[PDB]
């Protein structure tokens, strides 16, 4: 029982590094990569619009 009372404190740290931290890193990646996709599409839109006018 004492061994598993320490297994709790274990998983609480392992899960932070295995489950939480990478999901949080993925969120930051997705956000700053989305700004780049948007930036390229607005610049491309302006180019196509200028080419038409």
């Amino acid at each position: 029982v004492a061994v598993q009372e320490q297994e709790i404190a274990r998983r609480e740290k392992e899960l932070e590094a295995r489950v939480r931290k990478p999901a949080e890193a993925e969120r930051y990646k997705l956000e700053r990569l989305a700004e780049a996709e948007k930036s390229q599409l607005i610049m491309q839109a302006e180019a196509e619009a200028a080419s038409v006018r």
Partner: protein
């Protein structure tokens, strides 16, 4: 991560439609003014036919 991404790209699609819409309106307007000059000149010449 899914929400912010979808919203940012939906704004890009809307920006494209608006920019293309404005460019098109400027062309349609300019083309109409040029075509009206043809109709006017053709009319002012035809009116003198014997």
């Amino acid at each position: 991560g899914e929400k912010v991404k979808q919203v940012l790209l939906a704004q890009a699609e809307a920006e494209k439609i608006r920019k293309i819409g404005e460019a098109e309106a400027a062309v349609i307007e300019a083309m109409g003014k040029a075509e009206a000059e043809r109709m006017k000149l053709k009319a002012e010449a035809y009116q003198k036919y014997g």
